[PDB]
Design an enzyme around this catalytic site. Sequence first.
Site, short mmCIF file in Angstrom:
data_model
loop_
_atom_site.label_atom_id
_atom_site.label_comp_id
_atom_site.label_asym_id
_atom_site.label_seq_id
_atom_site.Cartn_x
_atom_site.Cartn_y
_atom_site.Cartn_z
N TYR A 236 115.56 -44.41 -48.78
CA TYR A 236 114.36 -45.24 -48.79
C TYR A 236 114.68 -46.67 -48.37
O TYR A 236 114.03 -47.22 -47.48
CB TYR A 236 113.72 -45.21 -50.17
CG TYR A 236 112.36 -45.87 -50.21
CD1 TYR A 236 111.26 -45.28 -49.59
CD2 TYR A 236 112.17 -47.09 -50.88
CE1 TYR A 236 110.01 -45.88 -49.62
CE2 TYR A 236 110.91 -47.69 -50.91
CZ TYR A 236 109.84 -47.08 -50.28
OH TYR A 236 108.59 -47.66 -50.30
N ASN B 81 100.61 -48.53 -42.06
CA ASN B 81 100.75 -48.47 -43.49
C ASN B 81 101.20 -47.10 -43.96
O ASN B 81 101.77 -46.99 -45.04
CB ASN B 81 99.42 -48.86 -44.15
CG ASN B 81 99.33 -48.44 -45.57
OD1 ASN B 81 98.77 -47.40 -45.85
ND2 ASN B 81 99.89 -49.22 -46.47
N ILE C 5 96.81 -49.60 -50.80
CA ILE C 5 96.88 -50.79 -49.96
C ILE C 5 96.16 -50.58 -48.64
O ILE C 5 95.40 -51.46 -48.19
CB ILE C 5 98.36 -51.18 -49.75
CG1 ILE C 5 98.89 -51.97 -50.96
CG2 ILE C 5 98.56 -51.96 -48.46
CD1 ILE C 5 100.42 -51.90 -51.04
N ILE D 78 102.83 -54.51 -57.25
CA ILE D 78 101.38 -54.31 -57.08
C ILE D 78 100.79 -53.32 -58.07
O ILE D 78 101.43 -52.33 -58.43
CB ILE D 78 101.05 -53.87 -55.64
CG1 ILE D 78 101.70 -54.83 -54.64
CG2 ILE D 78 99.55 -53.82 -55.42
CD1 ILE D 78 101.20 -56.25 -54.76
N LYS E 158 113.52 -48.66 -44.84
CA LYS E 158 112.68 -49.87 -44.89
C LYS E 158 113.39 -51.07 -44.27
O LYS E 158 112.76 -51.90 -43.62
CB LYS E 158 112.24 -50.18 -46.33
CG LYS E 158 111.31 -49.12 -46.93
CD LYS E 158 110.04 -48.89 -46.07
CE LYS E 158 109.09 -47.86 -46.71
NZ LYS E 158 107.82 -47.63 -45.96
N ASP F 91 94.08 -40.85 -42.13
CA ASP F 91 94.84 -40.40 -43.28
C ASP F 91 95.31 -38.96 -43.07
O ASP F 91 94.74 -38.21 -42.27
CB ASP F 91 94.04 -40.47 -44.57
CG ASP F 91 94.92 -40.25 -45.77
OD1 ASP F 91 95.69 -41.17 -46.08
OD2 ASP F 91 94.88 -39.16 -46.36
#
Lengths: 245, 232
Positions: B155, B91, B19, B188, B159, B38
């Site tokens: 997790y 991201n 993404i 996705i 989030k 990254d």
Amino acid sequence: SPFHLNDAVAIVTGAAAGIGRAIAGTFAKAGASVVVTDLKSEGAEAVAAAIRQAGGKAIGLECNVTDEQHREAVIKAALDQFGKITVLVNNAGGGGPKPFDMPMSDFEWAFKLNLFSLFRLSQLAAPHMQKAGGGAILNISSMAGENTNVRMASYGSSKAAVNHLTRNIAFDVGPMGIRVNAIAPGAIKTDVLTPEIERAILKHKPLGRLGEAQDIANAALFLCSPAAAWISGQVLTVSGGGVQE
Amino acid sequence: SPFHLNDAVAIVTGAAAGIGRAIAGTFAKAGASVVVTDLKSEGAEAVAAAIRQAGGKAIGLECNVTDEQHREAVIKAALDQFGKITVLVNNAGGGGPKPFDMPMSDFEWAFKLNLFSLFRLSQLAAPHMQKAGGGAILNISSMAGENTNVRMASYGSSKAAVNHLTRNIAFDVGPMGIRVNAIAPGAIKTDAKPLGRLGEAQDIANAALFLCSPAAAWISGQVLTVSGGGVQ
């Protein structure tokens, strides 16, 4: 009448005063043996002895819910004293408004105090509850977990973490016979200010009075009792209807 | 048309693949100078070079978003190369299903990686966004932020913290001229109903471009789920 805690053993943290104290006092009168904890062992001991004077069974202990040794001390003491654990009320917490640019240590501390502490204590109590045949965890969250305001970066996101922790781990501990719920208290008057300030607040409260600690403890007794045996994973907001904005 | 990013300088993290790579490329073709980061410096560079080769402006850097030195370096690098920061796309993240009895480090780490990193990157970028006259922060969250299931203690709640962080710090940085939004990706087709096909990283990138463009100048504190309608 299923709104009792006959033969229960309940840990109630941060309960020297306010909501946690009401919870421990109401849980004892409903038949539970209450393990009261607080940052100051004196405050937790006052409550436990009020309970004993009133006719119930309780012990108070010092516990810093962010220090792992204290957490295991509370588990061991409860089991040493009462032979089992079946109810855990994570009432301890803290924080409040902080500017957007707060130190990282401030931000991270809202989570160590408000989130990781209760999560590890749920981990620690859970195997004893399951061995005991079942039990109930209750997280005293806050309305900042749902509401959106300035200066809420740490306090609001940590409380949202708690709400959603609640929803999700009810799945993991259900098959151990454990339920997990949360209360989001509203404007509770704690043992505050002028009669003209209260009168103006009460123009925006639908029920036209603030809360008491016993209002939250009534909802706590409800949610940990067999009367809520089919309720798990809920955040229950106790706020008198909200505030007219 | 307000569906462009001319005048923008966009930091995009965790953008070597998936993404984030889709967002970096899409932001560049819409006109934004992109600072790609990254964990693997070479993956960040690969993306930047392909952007430049396709006629955009971008560079690539290593950034472990949990490292305060690395975060500081990424801010410094956007300023040195492009002179300003207007858009931050958080991201970078990680985690997934874990048993309820997971080690405490796994529980805590999901918060340092998914939440503490972005919030700190948001603090870093905000003065430069204000100074540049405004900007947009976009957090890439997850559907687990609002859904419920087994094995989701760390997790999902991290989030959820991202989601409600987004809703609240919109109040703090609005007066600076900054909008804050999140995307929860869903269904996705990670290289790893309403169509005859699954979600694509491009679908997420198109949403991210909208939420960061002047076409969303009046959208802040929102969490947009992009999942084909599948929810609950």
